[PDB]
Design an enzyme around this catalytic site. Structure first.
Site, PDB file in Angstrom:
ATOM      1  N   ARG B 152     -10.568  24.364  15.595  1.00 36.40           N
ATOM      2  CA  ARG B 152      -9.560  25.088  16.361  1.00 36.40           C
ATOM      3  C   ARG B 152      -8.997  26.347  15.697  1.00 36.40           C
ATOM      4  O   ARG B 152      -8.571  27.270  16.384  1.00 36.40           O
ATOM      5  CB  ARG B 152      -8.423  24.153  16.813  1.00 36.40           C
ATOM      6  CG  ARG B 152      -7.542  23.695  15.649  1.00 36.40           C
ATOM      7  CD  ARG B 152      -6.491  22.573  16.059  1.00 36.40           C
ATOM      8  NE  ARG B 152      -7.060  21.205  16.114  1.00 36.40           N
ATOM      9  CZ  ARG B 152      -7.420  20.473  15.056  1.00 36.40           C
ATOM     10  NH1 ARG B 152      -7.285  20.947  13.813  1.00 36.40           N
ATOM     11  NH2 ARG B 152      -7.888  19.240  15.220  1.00 36.40           N
ATOM     12  N   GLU B 366      -3.812  16.182   4.131  1.00 33.20           N
ATOM     13  CA  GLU B 366      -5.155  16.557   4.564  1.00 33.20           C
ATOM     14  C   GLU B 366      -5.057  17.266   5.916  1.00 33.20           C
ATOM     15  O   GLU B 366      -5.793  18.253   6.207  1.00 33.20           O
ATOM     16  CB  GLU B 366      -6.064  15.337   4.609  1.00 33.20           C
ATOM     17  CG  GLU B 366      -7.549  15.737   4.953  1.00 33.20           C
ATOM     18  CD  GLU B 366      -7.879  15.717   6.445  1.00 33.20           C
ATOM     19  OE1 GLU B 366      -6.976  15.480   7.345  1.00 33.20           O
ATOM     20  OE2 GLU B 366      -9.065  15.995   6.746  1.00 33.20           O
ATOM     21  N   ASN B 461     -12.925  18.480   5.714  1.00 30.14           N
ATOM     22  CA  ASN B 461     -12.385  17.225   5.176  1.00 30.14           C
ATOM     23  C   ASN B 461     -12.298  17.272   3.648  1.00 30.14           C
ATOM     24  O   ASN B 461     -12.705  18.268   3.041  1.00 30.14           O
ATOM     25  CB  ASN B 461     -13.193  16.037   5.726  1.00 30.14           C
ATOM     26  CG  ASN B 461     -12.311  14.822   5.986  1.00 30.14           C
ATOM     27  OD1 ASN B 461     -11.723  14.261   5.050  1.00 30.14           O
ATOM     28  ND2 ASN B 461     -12.189  14.441   7.274  1.00 30.14           N
ATOM     29  N   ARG B 478     -19.795   7.109   8.206  1.00 35.91           N
ATOM     30  CA  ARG B 478     -18.861   6.461   9.091  1.00 35.91           C
ATOM     31  C   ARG B 478     -19.672   5.989  10.281  1.00 35.91           C
ATOM     32  O   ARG B 478     -20.846   6.348  10.409  1.00 35.91           O
ATOM     33  CB  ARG B 478     -17.674   7.381   9.529  1.00 35.91           C
ATOM     34  CG  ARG B 478     -17.978   8.757  10.149  1.00 35.91           C
ATOM     35  CD  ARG B 478     -18.542   9.757   9.100  1.00 35.91           C
ATOM     36  NE  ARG B 478     -18.593  11.160   9.560  1.00 35.91           N
ATOM     37  CZ  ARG B 478     -19.566  12.025   9.304  1.00 35.91           C
ATOM     38  NH1 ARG B 478     -20.688  11.666   8.591  1.00 35.91           N
ATOM     39  NH2 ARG B 478     -19.406  13.261   9.755  1.00 35.91           N
ATOM     40  N   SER B 566     -38.171  41.672   1.822  1.00 38.26           N
ATOM     41  CA  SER B 566     -39.121  40.607   1.514  1.00 38.26           C
ATOM     42  C   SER B 566     -38.396  39.315   1.163  1.00 38.26           C
ATOM     43  O   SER B 566     -37.430  39.342   0.398  1.00 38.26           O
ATOM     44  CB  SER B 566     -39.993  40.998   0.322  1.00 38.26           C
ATOM     45  OG  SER B 566     -40.940  39.963   0.087  1.00 38.26           O
ATOM     46  N   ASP B 602     -27.234  13.969 -17.530  1.00 33.22           N
ATOM     47  CA  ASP B 602     -26.550  15.251 -17.439  1.00 33.22           C
ATOM     48  C   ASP B 602     -27.320  16.246 -16.575  1.00 33.22           C
ATOM     49  O   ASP B 602     -26.704  17.015 -15.817  1.00 33.22           O
ATOM     50  CB  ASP B 602     -26.263  15.837 -18.841  1.00 33.22           C
ATOM     51  CG  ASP B 602     -25.085  15.174 -19.530  1.00 33.22           C
ATOM     52  OD1 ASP B 602     -24.438  14.297 -18.916  1.00 33.22           O
ATOM     53  OD2 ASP B 602     -24.775  15.558 -20.668  1.00 33.22           O
ATOM     54  N   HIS B 625     -20.766  27.479  -3.138  1.00 32.27           N
ATOM     55  CA  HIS B 625     -22.072  26.742  -3.126  1.00 32.27           C
ATOM     56  C   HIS B 625     -23.075  27.667  -2.370  1.00 32.27           C
ATOM     57  O   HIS B 625     -22.899  27.906  -1.175  1.00 32.27           O
ATOM     58  CB  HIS B 625     -22.006  25.415  -2.312  1.00 32.27           C
ATOM     59  CG  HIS B 625     -23.134  24.464  -2.626  1.00 32.27           C
ATOM     60  ND1 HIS B 625     -24.465  24.739  -2.322  1.00 32.27           N
ATOM     61  CD2 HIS B 625     -23.129  23.269  -3.252  1.00 32.27           C
ATOM     62  CE1 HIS B 625     -25.221  23.744  -2.762  1.00 32.27           C
ATOM     63  NE2 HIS B 625     -24.431  22.826  -3.297  1.00 32.27           N
TER      64      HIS B 625
HETATM   65  O1  5PU Z   1      -9.107  15.611  11.644  1.00 35.02           O
HETATM   66  C1  5PU Z   1      -9.795  15.786  10.614  1.00 35.02           C
HETATM   67  C2  5PU Z   1     -11.136  16.553  10.621  1.00 35.02           C
HETATM   68  C3  5PU Z   1     -12.128  15.730  11.514  1.00 35.02           C
HETATM   69  C4  5PU Z   1     -13.582  16.237  11.475  1.00 35.02           C
HETATM   70  C5  5PU Z   1     -14.400  15.529  12.601  1.00 35.02           C
HETATM   71  C6  5PU Z   1     -13.932  15.924  14.039  1.00 35.02           C
HETATM   72  C7  5PU Z   1     -14.046  17.232  14.531  1.00 35.02           C
HETATM   73  C8  5PU Z   1     -13.603  17.529  15.854  1.00 35.02           C
HETATM   74  C9  5PU Z   1     -13.055  16.489  16.593  1.00 35.02           C
HETATM   75  C10 5PU Z   1     -12.582  16.666  18.077  1.00 35.02           C
HETATM   76  O2  5PU Z   1     -12.683  17.780  18.515  1.00 35.02           O
HETATM   77  O3  5PU Z   1     -12.242  15.639  18.734  1.00 35.02           O
HETATM   78  C11 5PU Z   1     -12.972  15.214  16.098  1.00 35.02           C
HETATM   79  C12 5PU Z   1     -13.388  14.895  14.807  1.00 35.02           C
HETATM   80  C13 5PU Z   1     -14.245  15.830  10.127  1.00 35.02           C
HETATM   81  O4  5PU Z   1     -15.244  16.488   9.813  1.00 35.02           O
HETATM   82  O5  5PU Z   1     -13.838  14.807   9.572  1.00 35.02           O
HETATM   83  N1  5PU Z   1      -9.418  15.328   9.438  1.00 35.02           N
HETATM   84  O6  5PU Z   1      -8.390  14.422   9.350  1.00 35.02           O
HETATM   85 CL    CL Z   2     -15.424  10.548   5.859  1.00 36.02          CL
HETATM   86 ZN    ZN Z   3      -8.673  12.501   8.971  1.00 38.82          ZN
HETATM   87 ZN    ZN Z   4      -7.343  14.492  11.395  1.00 35.30          ZN
END
Ligand code: 5PU
Ligand code: CL
Ligand code: ZN
Ligand code: ZN
Ligand SMILES: *[C@@H]1O[C@H](CO)[C@@H](O[C@@H]2O[C@H](CO)[C@@H](O[C@@H]3O[C@H](CO)[C@@H](O)[C@H](O[C@H]4O[C@H](CO)[C@@H](O)[C@H](O)[C@@H]4O)[C@@H]3O)[C@H](O)[C@H]2NC(C)=O)[C@H](O)[C@H]1NC(C)=O
Ligand SMILES: *[C@@H]1O[C@H](CO)[C@@H](O[C@@H]2O[C@H](CO)[C@@H](O[C@@H]3O[C@H](CO)[C@@H](O)[C@H](O[C@H]4O[C@H](CO)[C@@H](O)[C@H](O)[C@@H]4O)[C@@H]3O)[C@H](O)[C@H]2NC(C)=O)[C@H](O)[C@H]1NC(C)=O
Ligand SMILES: *[C@@H]1O[C@H](CO)[C@@H](O[C@@H]2O[C@H](CO)[C@@H](O)[C@H](O)[C@H]2NC(C)=O)[C@H](O)[C@H]1NC(C)=O
Ligand SMILES: *[C@@H]1O[C@H](CO)[C@@H](O[C@@H]2O[C@H](CO)[C@@H](O)[C@H](O)[C@H]2NC(C)=O)[C@H](O)[C@H]1NC(C)=O
Ligand SMILES: *[C@@H]1O[C@H](CO)[C@@H](O[C@@H]2O[C@H](CO)[C@@H](O)[C@H](O)[C@H]2NC(C)=O)[C@H](O)[C@H]1NC(C)=O
Ligand SMILES: *[C@@H]1O[C@H](CO)[C@@H](O[C@@H]2O[C@H](CO)[C@@H](O)[C@H](O)[C@H]2NC(C)=O)[C@H](O)[C@H]1NC(C)=O
Ligand SMILES: *[C@@H]1O[C@H](CO)[C@@H](O[C@@H]2O[C@H](CO)[C@@H](O)[C@H](O)[C@H]2NC(C)=O)[C@H](O)[C@H]1NC(C)=O
Ligand SMILES: *[C@@H]1O[C@H](CO)[C@@H](O[C@@H]2O[C@H](CO)[C@@H](O)[C@H](O)[C@H]2NC(C)=O)[C@H](O)[C@H]1NC(C)=O
Ligand code: 5PU
Ligand code: NAG
Ligand code: NAG
Ligand code: NAG
Ligand code: NAG
Ligand code: CA
Ligand code: CA
Ligand code: CL
Ligand code: ZN
Ligand code: ZN
Lengths: 682, 682
Positions: B152, B366, B461, B478, B566, B602, B625
């Site tokens: 968003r 978070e 995340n 998950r 290239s 290592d 990265h």
């Molecule tokens: O809310 C979050 C981020 C969630 C995102 C996953 C995600 C991303 C978008 C939605 C939605 O639009 O309903 C739902 C879940 C992640 O990669 O863990 N963290 O607490």
């Molecule tokens: Cl996770």
């Molecule tokens: Zn979450």
């Molecule tokens: Zn969340």
């Protein structure tokens, strides 16, 4: 037995002499065929000597050379006086056209005509005094400055920012002619026709101007010259004091502000601008036709694989490229490195191997901005930052014959003290005494009775990328002059084998002593079971540097009250570092377990690494060491020092003091973070 | 015996259920007293469970909250329709004022009045289609966008850059209402009054907007709000589809360009600008009174010290803060972590210790931009980059009940395959079959028959700082939905214990399976003698990503000819990586010697680390990265991908293609450099 004594006794003065002679018969300018041939010789001999692998690592970097058919010179204008086209070559020297004439590496081309201003050493302080005290304006003038005090590139940067359109550098006898010593070839003094070469870059640690951050390899994408890092914007040329006298003698305008602005020539040292009455109409004209060219350079990298920890590297490195014959700079150092490799290879042939891997390096293009060591470190940066135990530099072994001079990380102080106590002094009057005794007597610590002076590492040699960018514990040692009396022939054609053999070190005993110090340091770092670093020595100097930076700020008590500028966090972090290091040293003494050892050796190896800020210093991303990076405005804690520098002139004091507070927070955090690396790990 | 099976068998579904119930009875919004109390409970219980140390690490970070006495809402203007002030609370829920009403965290204050434009998902592609194809101008308009497709915050950034003066976000039933499922409380669908909360920051990995690079500790110097990282510049507010219908139904101007611009509401989905004829004079008015406030947050950090390599860390971390009750997000994850700690503590009490240290983390804030994990990683970055073996995330354990979903570094692919073959499927119809079998059947690899899909790690995340900034091998797993049919109640007040217990996982068997996968991964990473990473898996995907990026560039054959673009160097580096990794794997199989092992471990641990560029990506210093950082314009190789993105619109193609070549050089170099870390070390 194969121990340090065996290593040290195998080193011979007579071998260093032979190698120096071998390395200094023809010029070895970076990027030239002769220096490639010398690289190939060194590679061959290091293999012969017994190293496991010896490779050339090449890069294609920006270098700078005079135009052979269009010589650089300076005129008074009809051109009524011309500076020299070359230094008179030394007796017996025959390939004189392949001797590169004096020039300032990386100067742009140009023929600016104008009036002279005399800027003393062109230091920050000297320019402040010109503009702020004397109301003299350098804009559109040609500045003439004497060498010394600071790096010549800082002079050209300082000149540029004051608006000058050209710089003439010269060596004044006040700085480069020792009283009562005869000039080359009959002594070690600078004759009037001698000229100091040298680059005038302001790279801030970037390495090759065209590839900052990445090795100048076969597929590199290069910046255009317009976008390059650190190139000067105005023409620059160096001259000797015969030629300088001709340019300075007609100088008018303001007298010198005080005696510290007058050198030794029979001239008034008038600051100008311009000449006096009769000659008030004559001008000075530079003719600079040098070109910048991407050119291949070659490092020689020798490996002696460790028996127990082959993934831990101890590096001994110094440059090979020279302005001309390199009799002192760098071949007095490189001959030492060659004998060190020979000695290590002798023990290797008898079945011995160091505990840790030793890397030996012969760096190219050091004289053009530390290019060879920096490109190699950019190429190998991941290996170096996870495996690099230490870096010992090896440029000029002698710049005088008075006493030792060591600059290193505090982590090496105890190592250096202990080693020098076990080595014989080569000094007259100290027969049968230790090097530690002679050095401590001749160069006392300004702070502690019975201890020698050891200086900080700054900038300007090949340790720079390892220490200031990557945070690998670094050190250097050499023999030096009495600093109350560089050296006269620095970067001149008169730096020859004969200079060294006749006037500096006829018995090669100072060379041998320096081989013992550098070689011995490398031996301990590579063989000692526990790395020979004492973290308590860092705690001691951190308090000193915190006291110092606080004292600078406290020149502005009113502003510190107004903007609530506290150093409390920095002293707190230093106190914690002191307590934690004290406890770690107890554990290090109080532990059969090679995991605990290697855990502990890792904590010691990564302690230097912890002082690196991956965000670098402001606008200087390649200077990342928070304690020791060079100041932009050249003290330690350079972030805070630069924030405080000339702060009273800033137009927005709130913003300026906010930035001081930001730097205090960054420094306190970094100190505490480094301390926490020495905490119990879990 | 104390082995993985012992660990896995100790995990109980009924315990995860109890903890979920315990964690979801009151809201735990970041920065609130209730979430501090939950942190203290977790700290106490992890000590009870048997961890060696359990500490709170607190920071003071910028958070954002609605004004309790001055509610946010949207009007059609006389204000003739108002959006809701809160979601109807779920049955039986009593502390409804401490339920934070829906808002977009970090919105500035404002009351902009204007005309609506409908921007579909506000993707980059959607805005391109508005301006370039439809000639519609968003400047000074209020945009209304539906949630979904992308983060968003990217919508608000995309809107800002198109010149909008406000954003209204809403959940369209097309995206958030599953066909034929009843809405909460009688099923798992989103009712019309439900609203998705969520921050709208664009931090690019910086963490707390006020302290980028450094922990927000007690002495931190903070940026002013004006200089903060990533704050939105226009007011933003989210609403449900009942309220969205009221705002959309009067929309005029251009029809939707195609069906992909129409959701499920009984409205035309006219793009606008503005309303139709009769209402052409009415406007939309936002009232946003939220405030940003520096607020204390608390991470819980538990340590289980390793028996043999206590200086090597395996981290299991997930967040604790929730928008409201956190029934799925994050407490389904945190209950899993709690049972994992309990199981490890059970073996610990019987005398067992893991080989390596395990760190357990309950992250705060978070939901406000990954703040807790990022500040802790900034504080401990030196420890983490020299000691961090791996990071396993642990947010929501379930977002559906169809099959497993794993995103991880290729270094973990073999680990994940091998583990899931040894675990029982909880899926209906797969009784007595492995999780690997059920997962592979339901989520096949798009490339390889008989293997499951594993996705890349991106952003969004708490793994983000560890993987994208520090280069620590990371993974997550998950249970998820069938992706051909997020989840409806995401970040709404209806995310409750009852939602999970009634509709997602009544037997807690999917939770248990996820505990086994996360816990089992941590067990192997922390106990296996040789780290369970297969560098050959990185070689395979690097070729795939190089093929892909080459294919994108090859959409512009003429320009690649003209500017000599290239990819040869990148394919060469990938080929070398393949050969070197193959040889390293041979050595790893073919070596009693714990130095060689730990040397080899290592090399495995620092292989992820080698993909970090300390210069970061362009203008994004905290995404470092080179293989996997998020694209600015959201493929892998993000530096090259972003350089190629919309390149045909750049006004200076020479410059644009030069930058593509620069990124190819950086990527090839980085790949070769990572490969060389796996070479013999000396
Ligand atoms: O809310 C979050 C981020 C969630 C995102 C996953 C995600 C991303 C978008 C939605 C939605 O639009 O309903 C739902 C879940 C992640 O990669 O863990 N963290 O607490
Ligand atoms: Cl996770
Ligand atoms: Zn979450
Ligand atoms: Zn969340
Ligand atoms: C040097 O090491 C010492 C540890 O031996 C370390 O001490 C730490 O100092 C900080 C202060 O900077 C302490 O932080 C406090 O933590 C408590 C909770 O433990 C909080 O309640 C405190 O916050 C209140 O008080 C503040 C100060 O007036 C208010 O601003 C705030 O709003 C709260 O009301 C405060 O955050 C910390 O407890 C100790 N940690 C210890 C003793 O373990 C010190 O920080 C190190 N120095 C550096 C530079 O890191
Ligand atoms: C993948 O690994 C291989 C090693 O197995 C590695 O091969 C190296 O490639 C470079 C080319 O990029 C080679 O570089 C050459 O080195 C020789 C000296 O050894 C030089 O003479 C060459 O320069 C001449 O030719 C150039 C090309 O036409 C000219 O531009 C130049 O002006 C010179 O005339 C050239 O520099 C290098 O020898 C090998 N190294 C080996 C085989 O050990 C390859 O680079 C790796 N891929 C990546 C992306 O790193
Ligand atoms: C410096 O020493 C080197 C090594 O001894 C000399 O190079 C050798 O020269 C002989 C005679 O030309 C050759 O047969 C050898 O192959 C060379 N060995 C090498 C390059 O490893 C070199 O001649 C000496 N240089 C000077 C100026 O005295
Ligand atoms: C300084 O050098 C310049 C260039 O060599 C001298 O001026 C040149 O004189 C030659 C031969 O006498 C003429 O062919 C050129 O036309 C002149 N060129 C320029 C650029 O002036 C100049 O005379 C020298 N000055 C002194 C004092 O020797
Ligand atoms: C320098 O030498 C001193 C004196 O030998 C070393 O300090 C001793 O180290 C041993 C072994 O740890 C201890 O048992 C003694 O207590 C130490 N004596 C002291 C501190 O006075 C010191 O470690 C050496 N420095 C090195 C090796 O870097
Ligand atoms: C969640 O579980 C915790 C831990 O069992 C409960 O906290 C305990 O509550 C009892 C009764 O008040 C106290 O005597 C203990 O000291 C608490 N232990 C802690 C905090 O470690 C808590 O009540 C439960 N919460 C809910 C909502 O059921
Ligand atoms: C939307 O809400 C606003 C604010 O509560 C309503 O407008 C207010 O109406 C109250 C009481 O009738 C008055 O005291 C205020 O003067 C009004 N304030 C403003 C800012 O307009 C508005 O009527 C509501 N609209 C609907 C359809 O209920
Ligand atoms: C996953 O399991 C496979 C099959 O056991 C492991 O591959 C074997 O590893 C052993 C020990 O190195 C070798 O002797 C066999 O040749 C391997 N079989 C193969 C490659 O088919 C693999 O290492 C495991 N992955 C891990 C532990 O990360
Ligand atoms: O020439 C150099 C840099 C020399 C500097 C030391 C130095 C610095 C200045 C001078 C001088 O003005 O005569 C002489 C020597 C270093 O720190 O090694 N490298 O090859
Ligand atoms: C050097 O000067 C000569 C003679 O004036 C000129 O022809 C040539 O272009 C110059 N060489 C370089 C490399 O610029
Ligand atoms: C070498 O030392 C002796 C004694 O001071 C002296 O003859 C000579 O000046 C010294 N050389 C140099 C270069 O300092
Ligand atoms: C919230 O709004 C109230 C009532 O209008 C006001 O008095 C107060 O200043 C606001 N609070 C904050 C934290 O801005
Ligand atoms: C859980 O799975 C079963 C079978 O598909 C079903 O009744 C229910 O829809 C699932 N729940 C969710 C949230 O997908
Ligand atoms: Ca470079
Ligand atoms: Ca921060
Ligand atoms: Cl040196
Ligand atoms: Zn030198
Ligand atoms: Zn030099």
């Amino acid at each position: 037995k194969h121990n340090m004594k065996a290593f040290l006794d195998e080193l011979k003065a007579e071998n260093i002499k032979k190698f120096l002679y071998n390395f200094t018969q023809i010029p070895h300018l970076a990027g030239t065929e002769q220096n490639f041939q010398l690289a190939k010789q060194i590679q061959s001999q290091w293999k012969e000597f017994g190293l496991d692998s010896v490779e050339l690592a090449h890069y294609d970097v920006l270098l700078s050379y005079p135009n052979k058919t269009h010589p650089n010179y300076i005129s008074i204008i009809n051109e009524i006086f011309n500076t020299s086209l070359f230094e008179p070559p030394p007796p017996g020297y025959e390939n004189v056209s392949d001797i590169v004439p004096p020039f300032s590496a990386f100067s742009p081309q140009g023929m600016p005509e104008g009036d002279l201003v005399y800027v003393n050493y062109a230091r920050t302080e000297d320019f402040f005094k010109l503009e702020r005290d004397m109301k003299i304006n350098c804009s559109g003038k040609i500045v003439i400055a004497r060498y010394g005090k600071v790096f010549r590139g800082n002079k050209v940067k300082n000149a540029q920012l004051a608006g000058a359109k050209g710089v003439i550098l010269y060596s004044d006898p006040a700085d480069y002619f020792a009283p009562g010593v005869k000039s080359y070839p009959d002594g070690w003094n600078l004759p009037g026709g001698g000229v100091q070469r040298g680059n005038i870059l302001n790279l801030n640690g970037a390495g090759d101007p065209l590839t900052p951050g990445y090795p100048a390899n076969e597929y590199a994408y290069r910046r255009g010259i317009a976008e390059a890092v650190g190139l000067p914007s105005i023409p620059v040329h160096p001259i000797g004091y015969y030629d300088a006298q001709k340019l300075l003698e007609k100088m008018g305008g303001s007298a010198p502000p005080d005696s510290s602005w007058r050198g030794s020539l029979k001239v008034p040292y008038n600051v100008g601008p311009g000449f006096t009455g009769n000659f008030s109409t004559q001008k000075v004209k530079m003719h600079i036709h040098s070109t910048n060219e991407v050119t291949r350079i070659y490092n020689v990298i020798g490996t002696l694989r460790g028996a127990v920890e082959p993934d831990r590297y101890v590096i001994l490195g110094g440059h090979r490229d020279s302005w001309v014959f390199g009799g002192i700079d760098p071949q007095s150092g490189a001959a030492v490195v060659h004998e060190i490799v020979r000695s290590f290879g002798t023990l290797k042939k008898e079945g011995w191997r160091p505990r840790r891997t030793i890397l030996f390096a012969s760096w190219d293009a050091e004289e053009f901005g530390l290019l060879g060591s920096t490109e190699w470190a950019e190429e190998n940066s991941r290996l170096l930052q996870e495996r690099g135990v230490a870096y010992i530099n090896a440029d000029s072994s002698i710049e005088g014959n008075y006493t030792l001079r060591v600059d290193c990380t505090p982590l090496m102080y105890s190592l250096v003290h202990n080693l020098t106590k076990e080595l014989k002094s080569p000094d007259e009057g100290f027969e049968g005494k230790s090097l530690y005794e002679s050095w401590t007597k001749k160069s006392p610590s300004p702070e502690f009775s019975g201890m020698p002076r050891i200086s900080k590492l700054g900038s300007g040699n090949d340790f720079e990328v390892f220490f200031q960018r990557l945070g690998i514990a670094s050190g250097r040692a050499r023999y030096t002059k009495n600093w109350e009396t560089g050296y006269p022939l620095y970067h001149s054609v008169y730096e020859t084998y004969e200079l060294v053999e006749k006037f500096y070190d006829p018995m090669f005993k100072y060379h041998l002593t320096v081989a013992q110090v550098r070689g011995g340091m490398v031996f301990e770092l590579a063989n000692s079971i526990v790395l020979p670093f004492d973290c308590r020595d860092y705690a001691v100097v951190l308090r000193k540097y915190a006291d110092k930076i606080y004292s600078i700020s406290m020149k502005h008590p009113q502003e510190m009250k107004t903007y609530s500028v506290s150093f409390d966090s920095l002293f707190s972090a230093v106190k914690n570092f002191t307590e934690i290091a004290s406890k770690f040293s107890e554990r290090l003494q109080d532990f059969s377990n090679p995991i605990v050892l290697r855990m502990m050796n890792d904590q010691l190896m990564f302690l230097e690494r912890a002082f690196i800020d991956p965000l670098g210093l402001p606008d200087r991303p390649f200077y990342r060491h928070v304690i020791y990076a060079p100041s932009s405005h050249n003290e330690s804690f350079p972030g805070i020092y630069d924030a405080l520098f000339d702060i009273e002139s800033k137009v927005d004091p709130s913003k300026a003091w906010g930035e001081v507070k930001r730097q205090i927070y960054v420094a306190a955090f970094t100190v505490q973070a480094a301390a926490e690396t020495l905490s119990e790990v879990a």
